Design a protein around this ligand. Structure first.
Ligand SMILES: Nc1nc2c(ncn2[C@@H]2O[C@H](COP(=O)(O)OP(=O)(O)OP(=O)(O)O)[C@@H](O)[C@H]2O)c(=O)[nH]1
Ligand SMILES: Nc1nc2c(ncn2[C@@H]2O[C@H](COP(=O)(O)OP(=O)(O)OP(=O)(O)O)[C@@H](O)[C@H]2O)c(=O)[nH]1
Ligand SMILES: Nc1nc2c(ncn2[C@@H]2O[C@H](COP(=O)(O)OP(=O)(O)O)[C@@H](O)[C@H]2O)c(=O)[nH]1
Ligand SMILES: [Mg+2]
Ligand SMILES: [Mg+2]
Lengths: 49, 434, 47, 430, 49, 431
């Protein structure tokens, strides 16, 4: 009386790394980190005529 | 098969966090160079990461908008330990202007912090919660976390959390504008954090002077004592135990209602190697010292009200027998009275691992220890004083103008006072017997 | 830099405590009791 | 034949299991390493009662292990005698409900008990003819109380003819372990009574009462408590495994102690329990067995058995003894407390004799009976539960996870119905 | 009949212990891989430096 | 029996090819002198019968400065001496010059060289064409070369690693013109091509490789890495091989939409790589991370059609099959409604060897992606704005009328871009 799916929730040993490390994914590739280099090196100076 | 993520925003979290990680690092025997020395498994997984061989990456992400503190560690002894690129730093200081940290400069920072958190969470298998330590009595410290809490809560769902904040002392102060920043953070944090402990600093000032016999302690000494408490509370999740207590089994037995989730904790025993050897330190006397009025890590008098529910943790080689005797001893007591609606307010926990003494520090090594986390009605005293501090200066709108200059609506302060007053009304109500 | 230094100083006790916690510790009566059926010695072969 | 299987839920059942199998192996002689080294010949006659057989001669106890948290089982699966269980046998979860009855019975239990029911089904039906079940779980524990209780619910739904057993501990008012005991306990009793055929209650307070009063042991430890449960709990099954004078199955004691279809709670006691120094001075004799065995300071239950009138008392005398009787002592003992035996049930004690004693004690007996004294336990627990409920304190948890207040009131309704219906017979007269 | 039954105890215990070596062999052997790789690039760091 | 031929035009293509050739020779085991110190080099190299290995290459250009560097540098002995056809004058960003006046006379020589290279091989499977759009000579011979190749051969496939200009960072002024013009010519004659817009790489390099001041030398090395990763399956064994023939049967939903933008990871300089486990599960998450996408087109602004990713390293397929699950479950990236599932995978065995004195360190794991996402329409439209602002009053038009390009020729080009925009919108419209 056990369907195939949901049957992997049983814990056999620490091998669940490859199938259970994503439990709380912290969503997925949604947040933006583009052009966030403003924090490691100094901006190329910008001035006026 | 567990894990947790550590976060700190601002100097106050970093310094203790810098102070704390020696405790965790020293316990498991990982040498400061990060590489295991010389040559019992899965115990280190509780706080560390395995890349295959050698060193480990602490589950921490240090944040701050002022680079002074971060640079110090980044060139110090522990430099090689933390991940090279997880120490995100800002460029302009907050300068205790809370409005600055939440809408003008803080916006550009949370982008990374969310990212850095996300990556670390991914490698965790059974994420149980978070440890967020931030100084409410600071401009950047409160603001950065407050934004961090707001995103995170809407980020993950129903996850449990713990916050070991640091409120400002009632009469002795650090800054002059802190009374404001204390209230605003409360509202943004009241409806987002499940549990947060009360650890106002002065209490440790008196505690150190009363037992440890020190007439001139610096901030570091305070940093160690807080570190142990975290160790005592979270020690169960990684080692063997006769009756384990987990983080997710914490606010199932400490928060009577979804509203009132602010409790204070005290630590004991604390005794040096310079005086301890004259007492057997039997468990009969140890526990009673825990409830003594002057040892509350929160600058408030518990005797001013009834208790809601107390969860007290031991550690060492304590046999379960004594717990029954001590608990029976507490109930018969005459000075401490329990609220009418809570029949029994004790959740007994025991772990075998004894606290590890840090050579050259204050704490010595003893074969007993009990740490408590209790939510009691007395905490209303701290809240009432904060409002009285707050209300006055608003009377002539002193210093209010600057908060206006950062884009904060004038009424933004108006909503704050009601919540405390609204909460202030809440506290007494639960105190009325049926 | 002055406060934090190396001074690095680096589980049988835990195992001993765990084994200690699970011991019956009151033993029992020193048994002289040896197995024999209640109604087997009554009926024996007769000459 | 008429064999039984063991399913333990929650940490208590696990830690409890770790000792029972330690005791059972010693009497029959299973080598922890799983091979046989029995000295006599009778030891292998009925070894099927609690064991199976596979290649190589090893014997695999059929003890189902089920818990919602990983800490307990992996810890037991490595200590002494821990190699007997087949790792392929039984499973456990990874999250845990945390003393929250609702969580362990609706959300986490539902997704996990489906697989476990598979393991119980395969094991039990494989035997020649199943006799019954014995389940050990502490009512006051959240995860143990919730998922474990549900398994009993489904179990009785598929084998309407088999028997079942439960060994329970209820938090005594003096010593408490979790401030949230009332909610899960009150909910728990409602589900247990309707289906649980026999429900044994042992009070943590008494165990500490036993150790510090008779044994004179200076400092106890959890280890001592598990044996005391182990000594008696194994006692009620030995006569099912060895030939003797009067052998009684798990069903017979059911027949001779439960008067009606609803009252199914008994209190047990073991003897003799003697201090280290008093062993040689104490006299192993017939009068001492019965006299102490009815002593108040021996029953492992918080209730004082003198508070009411016994309904029926069942004993399983063990060891080779004469047969004029303790019965005459039982006959003599029956009258000597005339006011304490309810009149409308004459001949209110049963006797049974088996001929294989436990290792050490040349003569011993186990007590079991139904008494009106248990009325106090539920009364005090009833008083505690009503306290927290009027104010809805802590009520957010159970209400916020798919449950509604209506159910909680019912738990009060049935429990009051049970208790209110338990003292009526006490005042009943012929 | 017992003779053939007892003839396997030696086979399985030796075999499982025989297999158990593979459990310890791979773990100790695998650690040699990264160490060479992890130690490999320190020269790169010095070479990079 | 499987080989490939490379065609290059323009300085950017020349430099990228040079870098990819250092990478390729060093990986396969050919010393700089060409004398080797089983038959795996056939896929790219041709046997001399006795002696060195003759590289499979043919170069074109109209400015002799860069090429002349080749014939005096460290790789003088590598390529054929008559295969480096080099002209006299440079187009100088005048796309008209490169497609009607100076390139027309040179088209003959390139065709002959191409035919000669084809003759030697007996198992040709495809072509690789490199070119920079925003260049006078670059694009000019790019279009005519593709036209002639298609007309002469037929159905044989073609892959091109083109480079349009960044949204804000640019090196020319007329690049919006030659870029938009290049689109029309290439649309009907290029099968599969990957955007590698310049701007992104600096961000990619600057954040991770930990270099304050990267130069084009740093930039080029990576693209060689992408080509090597995509090609290594054809030349070495794999648990599930991928053949260049099996790309635009799986990454081109219709004959029109065939632009797929790729990304690489992990791209991590060695100063800090060894502080993380580079877990197979975590390596693939960075694959779809927007920050590392080599083209300045947010994947979050649109759905996904199908990304063909070829693993490379020691991945155990059991791991890979799990990895897809987390990404599909993620609600950040949603695939088009009509697409069943847009993943095809390949597994290789050898690790990436590190070019000497380089920045990128060697790791046991590596995965490269080639994905065609509907959002790619962002780049086409954005260049449309600048082209409209230009042609609104025809600044710089007057130098294309006399070169031989009819005035109307610019008009229809605009219509093609609008047609592509409408096609993207419609195909993205769900049923
Ligand atoms: N207990 C304790 N508190 C500290 C220590 N250092 C700073 N604080 C508290 O921190 C508050 C000010 O904030 P900071 O610690 O400087 O850091 P912050 O909260 O991020 O805000 P900033 O002050 O702008 O840095 C003060 O009111 C102090 O009460 C310390 O060493 N020990
Ligand atoms: N990837 C890469 N592209 C480059 C580099 N240098 C120049 N480019 C590209 O080249 C374009 C300019 O044309 P060039 O490549 O210099 O010259 P061309 O392709 O031969 O065409 P003409 O300029 O007419 O001679 C610019 O738009 C850049 O995109 C480089 O170092 N790396
Ligand atoms: N006899 C005995 N009882 C125990 C032991 N540990 C815990 N208990 C009892 O179990 C109760 C707690 O149950 P708990 O473990 O939380 O249940 P769970 O949540 O299902 O695991 C307490 O009231 C204790 O009285 C032990 O080692 N021996
Ligand atoms: Mg500051
Ligand atoms: Mg050029």
């Amino acid at each position: 009386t056990a369907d195939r799916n949901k049957q992997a929730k049983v814990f056999q040993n620490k091998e669940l790394a490859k199938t259970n490390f994503a439990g709380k994914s912290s969503p997925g590739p949604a947040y933006d980190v583009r052009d966030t280099d403003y924090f490691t090196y100094q901006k190329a100076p910008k001035w006026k005529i | 098969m567990r894990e947790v993520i550590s976060i700190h925003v601002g100097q106050g979290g970093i310094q203790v966090g810098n102070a704390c990680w020696e405790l965790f690092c020293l316990e498991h025997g990982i040498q400061p160079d990060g590489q295991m020395p010389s040559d019992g498994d899965d115990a280190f997984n509780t706080f560390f990461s395995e890349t295959g061989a050698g060193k480990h990456v602490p589950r921490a992400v240090f944040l701050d908008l002022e680079p002074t503190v971060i640079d110090e560690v980044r060139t110090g002894t522990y430099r090689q330990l933390f991940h090279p690129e997880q120490l995100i730093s800002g460029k302009e200081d907050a300068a205790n202007n809370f409005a600055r940290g939440h809408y003008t400069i803080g916006k550009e920072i949370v982008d990374l912090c969310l990212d850095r958190i996300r990556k670390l969470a991914d490698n965790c298998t059974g994420l149980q919660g978070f440890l967020v330590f931030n100084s409410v009595g600071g401009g950047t410290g409160s603001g950065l976390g407050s934004l961090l809490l707001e995103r995170l809560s809407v980020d993950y769902g129903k996850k449990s959390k713990l916050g070991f904040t640091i409120y400002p002392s009632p009469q002795v102060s650090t800054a002059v504008v802190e009374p404001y920043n204390s209230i605003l953070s409360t509202h943004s944090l009241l409806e987002h954090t499940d549990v947060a402990v009360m650890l106002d600093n002065e209490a440790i000032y008196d505690i150190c002077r009363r037992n440890l016999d020190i007439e001139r302690p610096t901030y570091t000494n305070l940093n160690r004592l807080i570190a142990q408490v975290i160790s005592s509370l979270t020690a169960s999740l990684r080692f063997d135990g006769a009756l384990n207590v987990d983080i997710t089994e914490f606010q199932t037995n400490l928060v009577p209602y979804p509203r009132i989730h602010f409790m204070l904790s005290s630590y004991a025993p604390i005794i040096s190697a310079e005086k301890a050897y004259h007492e057997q330190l039997s468990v009969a006397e140890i526990t009673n010292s825990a409830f003594e009025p002057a040892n509350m890590m929160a600058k408030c008098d518990p005797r001013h009200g009834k208790y809601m529910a107390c969860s007290m943790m031991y550690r060492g080689d304590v046999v379960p027998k004594d717990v029954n005797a001590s608990i029976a001893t507490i109930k018969t007591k005459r000075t401490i009275q329990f609220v009418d609606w809570c029949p029994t307010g004790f959740k007994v926990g025991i772990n075998y691992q004894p606290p590890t003494v840090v050579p050259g520090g204050d704490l010595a090594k003893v074969m007993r220890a009990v740490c408590m986390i209790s939510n009691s009605t007395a905490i209303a005293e701290v809240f009432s004083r904060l409002d009285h501090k707050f209300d006055l200066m608003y009377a002539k709108r002193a210093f209010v103008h600057w908060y206006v200059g950062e884009g904060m609506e004038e009424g933004e302060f108006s909503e704050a006072r009601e919540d405390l007053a609204a909460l202030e009304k809440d506290y007494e109500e639960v105190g009325i017997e049926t | 830099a002055k406060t934090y230094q190396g001074k690095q100083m680096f589980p049988e006790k835990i195992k001993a405590l765990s084994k200690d916690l699970r011991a019956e510790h009151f033993k029992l009566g020193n048994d002289p009791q040896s197995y024999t059926s209640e109604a087997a010695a009554k009926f024996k072969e007769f000459d | 034949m008429r064999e039984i299987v063991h399913i333990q839920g929650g940490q208590c059942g696990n830690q409890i299991g770790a000792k029972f199998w330690e005791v059972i192996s010693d009497e029959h002689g299973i080598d922890p390493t799983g091979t046989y080294h029995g000295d006599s010949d009778l030891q292998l006659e009925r070894i099927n009662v609690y064991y199976n057989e596979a290649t190589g001669g090893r014997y695999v106890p059929r003890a189902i292990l089920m818990d919602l948290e990983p800490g307990t089982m992996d810890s037991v699966r490595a200590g002494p005698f821990g190699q007997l269980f087949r790792p392929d046998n039984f499973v456990f979860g990874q999250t845990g409900a945390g003393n929250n009855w609702a969580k362990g019975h609706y959300t986490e239990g539902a997704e996990l008990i489906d697989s476990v029911l598979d393991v119980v089904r395969k094991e039990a039906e494989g035997c020649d003819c199943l006799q019954g079940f014995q389940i050990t779980h502490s009512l006051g524990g959240g995860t143990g109380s919730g998922m474990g209780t549900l398994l009993i619910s489904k179990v009785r739904e598929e084998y309407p003819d088999r028997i079942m057993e439960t060994f329970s501990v209820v938090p005594s008012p003096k010593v408490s372990d979790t401030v949230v005991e009332p909610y899960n306990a009150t909910l728990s009793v409602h589900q247990l009574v309707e289906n649980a055929d026999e429900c044994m209650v042992i009070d943590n307070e008494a165990l500490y009462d036993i150790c510090f009063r008779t044994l004179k042991l200076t400092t106890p430890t959890y280890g001592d408590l598990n044996h005391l449960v182990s000594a008696a709990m194994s006692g009620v099954t030995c006569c099912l495994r060895f030939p003797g004078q009067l052998n009684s199955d798990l069903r017979k004691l059911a027949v001779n102690l439960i008067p009606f279809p609803r009252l199914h709670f008994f209190m047990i006691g073991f003897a003799p329990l003697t201090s280290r120094g008093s062993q040689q001075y104490r006299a192993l004799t017939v009068p001492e067995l019965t006299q102490q065995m009815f002593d108040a300071k021996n029953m492992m239950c918080a209730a004082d058995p003198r508070h009411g009138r016994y309904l029926t008392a069942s004993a399983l005398f063990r060891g080779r003894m004469s047969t004029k009787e303790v019965d005459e002592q039982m006959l003599n003992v029956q009258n000597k407390n005339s006011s304490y035996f309810v009149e409308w049930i004459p001949n209110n004690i049963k006797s049974s004799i088996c001929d294989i004693p436990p290792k050490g004690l040349k003569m011993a007996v186990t007590f079991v009976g139904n008494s009106t004294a248990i009325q106090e336990m539920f009364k005090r627990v009833a008083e505690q539960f009503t306290a927290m409920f009027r104010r809805k304190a802590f009520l957010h948890w159970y209400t916020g996870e798919g449950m509604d207040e209506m159910e909680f009131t019912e738990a009060e309704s049935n429990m009051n119905d049970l208790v209110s219906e338990y003292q009526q017979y006490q005042d009943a007269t012929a | 009949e017992k003779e053939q039954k007892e003839l396997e105890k030696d086979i399985l215990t030796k075999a499982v212990a025989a297999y158990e070596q593979e459990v310890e062999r791979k773990k100790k052997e695998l650690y040699l891989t990264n160490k060479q790789h992890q130690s490999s690039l320190i020269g790169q760091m010095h070479d990079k430096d």
